[PDB]
Amino acid sequence: GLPSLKSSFVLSESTVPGTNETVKTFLPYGSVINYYGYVKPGQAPDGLVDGNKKAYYLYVWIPAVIAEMGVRMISPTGEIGEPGDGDLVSDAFKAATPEEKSMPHWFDTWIRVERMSAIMPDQIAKAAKAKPVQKLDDDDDGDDTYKEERHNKYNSLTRIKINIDTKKLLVRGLYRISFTTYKPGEVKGSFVASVGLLFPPGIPGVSPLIHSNPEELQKQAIAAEESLKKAAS
């Protein structure tokens, strides 16, 4: 089903004699999260992008500078697969039928990454309600990880990585990822979002944390630093 979301960091490379091909081995992200959603006409989104595009959010708390972040969005999901263990699944997606999650129902995806104002774990729920601080990137039709043949190649993919611009320094802070649409107004279909972070996972207060609910992210981000405090005394 879903192809792995890997970093752009090349570990190994070898060309295949007598062909135009070359095999590349990429360093995987320390942590990857998949998010299954469903856009139903007449159903409220998490928010709007540029005032008229339905958007759904994932929030990322980064305790310390990270080399690269990968973001991907594909629609639809039916022909690819269903959520597995550890995947995030929206209520709308659970309610949707196999037929609703497959062709011909889909939409033209769009991704936007923004830096929020929070710089401490307990400011996360607050910053989520506040306006963005800087837009880091937008991508329309960038995906090349999934061989899309059900329709035009309109799936999204963006990699934010490293006088280099500040718009790609993933330093300590809160980030919001908007999974949205190319087309303004009403749209219909399933989608799967993927987020990868190039950093060792599972080190409380040091490793990045991801969630769709800011309040929940805060709770976890706070506990994680408390754990780090405790260990350091």
Exposure on the CB side of residue 144, measured as CA atoms within 13 A: 5
Minimum Å distance from CB 193 to its own copies?
A: 16
- Number of residues that make up the chain: 233
Helix (H) or strand (E) holding 221: helix 214-231
* 56 belongs to an annotated ligand binding site: no
**Is 33 in contact with 210 (CB distance < 8 Å)?**
yes
Among 82, 87, 137, 141, binds Ca ion (CB under 5 A): 141
**Interface with its own copies (CB under 8 A):** 1-4, 6, 9-28, 30, 64-67, 108, 115, 117, 119-120, 122-123, 126, 133-134, 141, 144-147, 152-154, 162-164, 166-167, 169, 171-172, 182, 198, 200, 203-206, 225, 228-229, 231-233
Helix (H) or strand (E) holding 160: strand 156-161
Strands laid side by side in the 189-197 sheet = 88-89, 31-39, 189-197, 68-74, 156-161
What is the Cα–Cα distance from 187 to 172, expressed in whole angstroms?
A: 35
**Binding marks (x or -) toward Ca ion, 30..69, rule CB under 5 A?**
----------------------------------------
Stretch that binds Ca ion, among 61-69, 81-89, 148-156, 213-221 (CB under 5 A): 148-156
* 109 belongs to an annotated ligand binding site: yes
What is the Cα–Cα distance from 22 to 206, expressed in whole angstroms?
A: 36
- Where on the chain is the footprint of Ca ion (CB under 5 A)? 108-109, 140-141, 154, 182
Binding residues for Ca(2+): 108-109, 140-141, 154
